[PDB]
From a paper:
Botulinum neurotoxins (BoNTs) are produced by the anaerobic spore-forming bacteria Clostridium botulinum and cause neuromuscular paralysis (i.e., botulism) by proteolytic cleavage of SNARE (soluble N-ethylmaleimide-sensitive factor attachment protein receptor) proteins. All BoNTs are expressed as a single polypeptide chain that must be cleaved post-translationally to form the active di-chain molecule which is comprised of a 100 kDa heavy chain (HC) and 50 kDa light chain (LC). They all share a similar three-dimensional structure; the heavy chain folds into two distinct domains (the cell binding domain [HC] and the translocation domain [HN]), and the LC is a Zn2+-dependent metalloprotease. However, a BoNT-like gene (homologue of BoNT) was recently identified in the non-clostridial species, [name] faecium, which is the leading cause of hospital-acquired multi-drug resistant infections. Interestingly, BoNT/En possesses the unique ability to cleave at least one member of all three SNARE-protein families (SNAP-25, VAMP, and STX); however, the cleavage of STX1 was only observed in vitro.
The structure of LC/En was determined at 2.0 Å with one molecule in the asymmetric unit by molecular replacement using the predicted structure from the AlphaFold2 server as a search model. Clear electron density was observed throughout the structure except for residues 127–130 and 249–260 which could not be modelled. The overall fold of LC/En is similar to all BoNT serotypes and homologues identified to date, consisting of a mixture of α-helices (31%) and β-strands (19%). The Zn2+ ion is coordinated by the HExxH motif residues, His225, Glu226 (via a bridged phosphate ion that has likely replaced the catalytic water molecule as observed in BoNT/A structure), His229, and an additional residue, Glu269 (inset). The analysis indicates that LC/En appears to have a much larger cleft volume than its closest related homologue, LC/X, and is most similar to LC/A. The presence of a glycine residue within the putative S1 subsite is particularly interesting as it would contribute to enhanced flexibility and reduced steric hindrance close to the catalytic zinc ion, such that it is less restricted by which substrate it can accommodate. Additionally, the lysine residues at positions 168 and 195 in place of hydrophobic residues (Phe163 and Phe194 in LC/A) within the S1′ subsite may further contribute to substrate promiscuity, given their increased length, rotamer angles, and potential ability to form both polar and non-polar contacts within the active site depending on the substrate. Loops 1 and 4 are significantly longer in LC/En compared to LC/A, LC/F, and LC/X. The additional portion of loop 1 contains several charged residues whereas loop 4 is predominantly hydrophilic, and the increased length of both loops may contribute to the substrate promiscuity observed for LC/En.
Author numbering: 0 to 248, 262 to 413
Write the structure that this text describes.
């Protein structure tokens, strides 16, 4: 409906356009006097729509994520398999699964708007003596076959496979700009095939769920959206990870998880959010207004992208200033509209009522490319009421242990 999901396949050759050889963003990460990721291979990467890249490789780029074998005390909801995503055939499956998920998200107007937002929400650039331009942390390196850089490419969201634990999913904001008002790209680590399941008792009381459903599997497009929403916050420089936390039901859940998950729990932390909001908005004003007002060319594309990312940003060349009420409204709208709960409703899939869970029922494997399992329009519920296509009992969900 607005972005187009490119039809790419793993075996398609590098074309230096949508299919590139990518050097990882954290290639030069120094942790504790070690260059953690030196000599990691350059990776085949697929731009599935502007500035969103899929890389069918295991995420092994923090030092906690280097060993694919199980640790000493593995969680009961973890699963380890060093061979997952090692062959080219598996990378194609992964790429095709990711493409199907994006098409699902793109199946409604709200998901179209979301993907557009990811596509266009540039991190704010740096001033360079008159010249506003992208900094080195705001681009990925496109490489030849020999370790030389051919050029620098924009990236907003990079999706990789899981780390050691096939079941774990998440968003890694590249830099501290995630919370400074400037923003940064996010690396997501995600398996479309390996999922945790939840009791329907964890679903809210209003839920339309069939009574034969004891235990359900989340729609992988909705789970992907959860992580893309962290992504989006990182692009807007409004990550709430260090802004505060709340103790539920107890255990501590940071504001970033709460606002991302959506639903009722948002009301509990609202008073705390409202104290902090002025500061966040001010970091936004303070970061973007000086930058944009350096641009002396009215046809500058940065100008346009900034005004498009922040419609609250008004004025004329050299003299752009936020509308303070509007910017507050628009940021709050990001959280209120773009969150997991709202996207579950929007794609009509069952999710749970609360981010924190007491336990996982099962861990399962499912291939959404297989015949009769998953459609763009309905995910697991093609021709099902009460979300029955998401019950663990379906032939397409295999329990692991
Ligand atoms: Zn999260």
């Amino acid at each position: 409906g607005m972005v187009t999901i490119n039809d790419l396949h793993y075996s398609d050759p590098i074309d230096e356009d949508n299919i590139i050889n990518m050097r990882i963003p954290l290639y030069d990460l120094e942790v504790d006097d070690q260059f953690i990721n030196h000599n990691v291979p350059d990776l085949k990467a697929f731009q599935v729509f502007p500035n969103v890249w899929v890389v069918p490789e295991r995420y092994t780029f923090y030092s906690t994520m280097k060993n694919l074998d199980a640790p000493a005390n593995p969680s009961r909801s973890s699963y380890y398999d060093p061979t997952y995503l090692q062959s080219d055939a598996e990378k194609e499956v992964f790429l095709q699964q990711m493409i199907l998920l994006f098409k699902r998200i793109n199946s409604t107007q709200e998901g179209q708007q979301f993907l557009n937002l990811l596509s266009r929400s540039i991190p704010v650039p740096y001033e360079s003596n008159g010249d506003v331009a992208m900094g080195t942390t705001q681009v990925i390196k496109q490489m030849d076959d020999k370790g030389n850089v051919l050029k620098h490419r924009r990236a907003h969201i990079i999706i990789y496979g899981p780390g050691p634990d096939l079941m774990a999913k998440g968003s890694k904001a590249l830099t501290k700009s995630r919370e400074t008002g400037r923003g940064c790209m996010a690396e997501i680590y995600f398996s479309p095939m390996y999922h945790k399941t939840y009791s329907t008792k964890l679903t809210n009381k209003n839920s339309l769920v069939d009574k034969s459903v004891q235990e359900f599997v989340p729609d992988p497009a909705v789970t992907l959206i959860h992580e893309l929403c962290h992504g989006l916050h990182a692009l807007y420089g409004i990550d709430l990870g260090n802004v505060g936390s709340w103790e539920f039901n107890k255990e501590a859940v940071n504001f970033e998880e709460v606002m991302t998950f959506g639903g009722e729990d948002v009301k509990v932390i609202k008073s705390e959010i409202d104290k902090k909001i002025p500061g966040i908005l001010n970091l936004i004003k303070t970061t973007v207004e000086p930058i944009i007002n350096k641009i002396t060319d009215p046809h500058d594309e940065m100008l346009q992208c900034l005004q498009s990312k922040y419609p609250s940003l008004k004025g004329t060349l050299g003299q752009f200033f936020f509308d303070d009420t509007q910017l507050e409204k628009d940021i709050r709208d990001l959280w209120m509209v773009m969150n997991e709960t709202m996207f579950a409703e929007n794609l009509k899939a069952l999710t749970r009522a609360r981010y924190l869970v007491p336990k996982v029922e099962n861990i399962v494997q499912v291939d959404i490319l297989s015949p009769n399992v998953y459609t763009i329009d309905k995910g697991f519920n093609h021709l099902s009421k009460g979300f029955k296509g998401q019950s663990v009992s379906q032939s397409y969900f295999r329990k692991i242990s």
